[PDB]
Amino acid sequence: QKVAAHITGITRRSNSALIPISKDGKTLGQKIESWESSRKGHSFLNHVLFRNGELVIEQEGLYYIYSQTYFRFQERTKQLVQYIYKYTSYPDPIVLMKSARNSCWSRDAEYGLYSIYQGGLFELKKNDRIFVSVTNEHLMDLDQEASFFGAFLIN
Amino acid sequence: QKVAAHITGITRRSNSALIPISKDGKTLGQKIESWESSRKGHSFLNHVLFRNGELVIEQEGLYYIYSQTYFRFQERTKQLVQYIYKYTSYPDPIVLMKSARNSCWSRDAEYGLYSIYQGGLFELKKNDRIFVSVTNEHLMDLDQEASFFGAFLIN
Amino acid sequence: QKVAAHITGITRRSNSALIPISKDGKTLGQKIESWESSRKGHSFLNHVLFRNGELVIEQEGLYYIYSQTYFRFQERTKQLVQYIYKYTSYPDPIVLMKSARNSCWSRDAEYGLYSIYQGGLFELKKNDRIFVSVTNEHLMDLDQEASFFGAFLIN
Ligand SMILES: [Cl-]
Ligand SMILES: [Cl-]
Ligand SMILES: [Cl-]
Ligand SMILES: [Cl-]
Ligand SMILES: [Cl-]
Ligand SMILES: [Cl-]
Ligand SMILES: [Cl-]
Ligand SMILES: [Zn+2]
Known part of the structure; x- marks a missing residue:
């Protein structure tokens, strides 16, 4: 039997003006599409499909989903935000998880290094993307060591 | 058979003065209580109870436990720390995991965005909280996308 | 049946000069060896060995691997990087995951608090380290609450 829980902050639609939530179903950020999915020892797919930058569910159930995204830049602040989205039978793409950083504000900032990891448990349906x-x-730095995206089914 | 490991730094009682550890069983921070636990597609409970801001264990075993907490503010540094605590048959609440950030020190800092994720594996008993x-x-920003708390049993 | 996926950025060998990748099989950073592995309620091993700072695999399969490392200092920027490495039947140690931060650049920076968590899914062989x-x-602060390292097999 699967024993698990995922509970969230009660604010369903945040009124924050800093990183505005979208009200017309528009996706925030740009979707990452340059993923590698079949290098033995580094990446793999087992009963999960990959296409168009999306992991597509073959088996309904509970998944732990995670991503790390590595921001690296050489030189005002930069808003560095990672969204993990779901398409399902719903008119809008759905933000499952959001994680945000601001770069250092100091005028002495020569460069930045901001790895953002997040993950969590979500119930998914077959053909969810x-x-x-x-x-x-x-x-973004698409270093295979530093930037990745995965999920696994919890039995 | 369950195959797993969780090993920790050897310092049992840290002598750090920056974020002092508590010596009289007092909880650090303020417990988050405004969690939502039953919005299909966003939150759920399966053989885990929720009450008084706590996930309460029904089934003894090994759990991966995690939380993300989103600090967002508009304007000295702020100490932004997330504690995941356990109550069990022990006279003190027990810090299982601690994760800390300091906000940017620059006087030019207009706002801050600090999402803190952590998680790990812990053996739990029935009625642990x-x-x-x-x-x-x-x-803290209780945006349901950005702040959450969960766990799952590892079989 | 195990249902899972881990996909990575396509850049196999990053040309970044900021945190240079190693070209002669040399390990970056210093290996953490002061881990505690058998304090009930805080750490454990189940069909995973520990020796010389390494978790050594007894059972081939897919593992979710994670580590948190807590950087704390009192006082130019510091490059704070966490590497999770694998030794296998391969001439070089293999970076599985890299996560990086830079400390605040402000000359007003009195201290720093930088907890770095990362994790992901990797297929491991028996006797991999x-x-x-x-x-x-x-x-690094080896506070057992703040710094840890673990993994679990996904069935
Ligand atoms: Cl920006
Ligand atoms: Cl880049
Ligand atoms: Cl503070
Ligand atoms: Cl707020
Ligand atoms: Cl450095
Ligand atoms: Cl900063
Ligand atoms: Cl230290
Ligand atoms: Zn700064």
Whole structure:
């Protein structure tokens, strides 16, 4: 038997003006599409499909979903945000998880290094599509060690 | 058969003066109590109870426990710390996991965005109570996308 | 049946000069060796061995691997990087996961608090050895609440 829990803050639609939530179903950030999915020892797929930057569910159930995104830049603040999204039978793409950083404000800032990891438990249906979207994609580093995206089914 | 490991730094009682450990069983931070636990597609409980801001264990075993807490503020540094605590048959609440950030020190800092994720594996007993506690709770953002708390049993 | 996926950025060998990748099989950072592995309620091993700072695999399969490393210091920027490495039947130690932060650049910075968590899914073989390595080890805090390393097999 599966024994698990995922509970969230009660604010369903946040009124925050800093990183505005979208009200017309528009995706925030730019979807990451340059993922590698079949290098033995580094990446794999087992009964999960990959296409168009999305992991597509074959088996309904509870999944732990996670992503790390590595922001690296050389030189005002940058808003560095990672979104994990779900498409399902619903008119809008759904933000499952959001994680945000601001770069250092000091005028002495020569460069930045901001790895953002997050993950959590979500009930998914067959043919749901999940993907990662980030602000400031031009600052993302697609180093296979530093940026990745995965999920596993919990039995 | 369950195959797993969780090993920790050897310092049992840290002598650090920056974020002092408590010596009289007093909880650090303020417990988060405004969690939502039953919105299909966003939150759920399966053989785990929720009450008084705590996840309460029904089935003894090994759990992966995690929480994300989103600090957002508009304007000295702020100590932003997330504690995951356990109550069991022990005279004190027990810190299982601690994760800390300091806000940017620059006088030019207009705002802050600090999402803190952590998680790990802990052996739990029936009726153990686990909760999340944070410093600077007034800066926490209970956006359901950004702040959450969960666990799952490992078979 | 195990249902899971882990996909990575396509850049196999990153050309970044900021945190240079190693080209002669040399390990980056210093391996953490002062882990505690058998304090009931805080740490444990179940069909995983510990020796020489490494978790050593007894059972081939898919593992979710994670580590948190807590950097704390009192006082230019510091590069704070966590590497999770694998030794297997391969001439070089293999970086599985890298996560990086830079400390605040402000000259007003009195102290720093930088907890770094990361984790992910990797297929491991029997007798593979996995460990954590960090830059600026003298700034690591081996508080058992704040710094840890674990993994579990996914069935
Ligand atoms: Cl920006
Ligand atoms: Cl880049
Ligand atoms: Cl403070
Ligand atoms: Cl707030
Ligand atoms: Cl450095
Ligand atoms: Cl900063
Ligand atoms: Cl230290
Ligand atoms: Zn700063």
